[PDB]
């Protein structure tokens, strides 16, 4: 069904697929095995649809959180890296590709939100959320604002809500306890209350979303935003003299962003599983292999320790990994779906004054 004795690789069209194809050329130069890289349209739904019929690529690249359900459906093979190879990648990235106790993909890249700041407006950005009100009053006297970021998605607001103790599901030793939910605990209430107080005191506007915040920062109107490495290209085009740093702390504790891990899974239907392992372990997950992909399209931070140490000479990448290591892996379990939609309503309701903080988080835990 899938052709034996070659490799077909699918990766999304926003990634460095030409660099990946070049790694495949090097593999062919050593082994005679042809490696074909594709970036099919509608890849997110195409892979599960085609793989469910026993067809498709040998290797699929996607964010780890979707791979949990692919493994549940029997679409991904368990991978078999030795201890020596596992030691080459950060331990938390292996946790992101663990499902039902089995490793089901190779971690490649790591992304998380960071604090992005305008160096001309704010050379020394605040280390704490608690400083933002006074900083905003200063900047508003100069026709600016301190901070604008997407308040509409819990992906952006949860890092502050998690700082003092909020969480979706308790995660200990690679397993989630879906009976242990921290959406309305004291820490979540503390963080959401600080957020709503920022709005109450006119330091943020409850309507600010992704597009409003991005325009305001790239036009030099606000001193800070919160966003991920996918947004850096637009800020480059704007020529804003920006930096990227650790998220502000809340009550002395780090903001805890969700972490996404671009990962490479092996199709359960592939008759080339050992070839795929050899390509991924010995060619792609090397300094030379990740460099080829990164030179085509930057990966951001990476799961390979050796190459991350090189990339982290860029303080933006060092900040990305620092924030990711202070954050939480995005859960790959289906129970996480209800979290996004419930907390989205809760924050909207608290920020607009339709519910109190305690009422909103109570309904969200409910």
């Amino acid at each position: 069904k899938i052709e034996e004795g070659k490799l077909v690789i699918w990766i999304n069209g926003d990634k460095g697929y030409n660099g990946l194809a070049e790694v495949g050329k090097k593999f062919e130069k050593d082994t005679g095995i042809k490696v074909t890289v594709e970036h099919p349209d509608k890849l997110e739904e195409k892979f599960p649809q085609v793989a469910a019929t026993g067809d498709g690529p040998d290797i699929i690249f996607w964010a780890h959180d979707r791979f949990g359900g692919y493994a549940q459906s029997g679409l991904l093979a368990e991978i078999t890296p030795d201890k020596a190879f596992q030691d080459k990648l950060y331990p938390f990235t292996w946790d992101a590709v663990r499902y039902n106790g089995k490793l089901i993909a190779y971690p490649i890249a790591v992304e998380a939100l960071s604090l992005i700041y305008n160096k001309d407006l704010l050379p020394n950005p605040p280390k704490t959320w608690e400083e933002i009100p006074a900083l905003d009053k200063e900047l508003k006297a100069k026709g600016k604002s301190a901070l604008m970021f997407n308040l509409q998605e819990p992906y952006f607001t949860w890092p502050l809500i998690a700082a003092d103790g909020g969480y979706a599901f308790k995660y200990e030793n690679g397993k989630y306890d879906i009976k242990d939910v921290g959406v309305d605990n004291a820490g979540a209430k503390a963080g959401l209350t600080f957020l709503v107080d920022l709005i109450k005191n006119k330091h943020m506007n409850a309507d600010t979303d992704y597009s409003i915040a991005e325009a305001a920062f790239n036009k030099g109107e606000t001193a800070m935003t919160i966003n991920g490495p996918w947004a850096w290209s637009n800020i480059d085009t704007s020529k804003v003299n920006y930096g990227v740093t650790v998220l502000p702390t809340f009550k002395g504790q780090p903001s805890k962003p969700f972490v996404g891990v671009l990962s490479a899974g092996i199709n359960a239907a592939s008759p080339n599983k050992e070839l795929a392992k050899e390509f991924l372990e010995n060619y792609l997950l090397t300094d030379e292999g990740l460099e080829a992909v990164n030179k085509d399209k930057p990966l951001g931070a990476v799961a390979l320790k050796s190459y991350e140490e090189e990339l982290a000479k860029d303080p933006r990448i060092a900040a990305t990994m620092e924030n990711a290591q202070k954050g939480e892996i995005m859960p790959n379990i289906p129970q996480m779906s209800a979290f996004w939609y419930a907390v989205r309503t809760a924050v909207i309701n608290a920020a607009s004054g339709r519910q109190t903080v305690d009422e909103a988080l109570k309904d969200a835990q409910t």
Partner: nanobody
Amino acid sequence: PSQVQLVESGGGSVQAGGSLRLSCAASGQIEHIGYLGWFRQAPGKEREGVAALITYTGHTYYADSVKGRFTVSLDNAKNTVYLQMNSLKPEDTALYYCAAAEWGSQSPLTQWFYRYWGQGTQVTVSA
């Protein structure tokens, strides 16, 4: 199969200055769709965003080249999102796609944000 299905209709040919309405029927488990987008792609060109509707805020965003000419709207009862295209220009010729997402971390104005995609409907404008 996909948990959400999107079906575009309404494509056609219009002389420059005229109008045309597209529709996109959404079906399946659509309870948590927070974002509906219209995109277009002509041969030899990158796919580009046309209009984005944020269902839970009502905010609508338009490409600079179509702002003031196109209108995106949602009929929640019919689970159908529309693209009303007024004052059409030859540069609007393309295959038009609707797309949907429950949530996302990236920009709702970009194609990479959207999980579900329709088959596309052809719009041709002549000068």
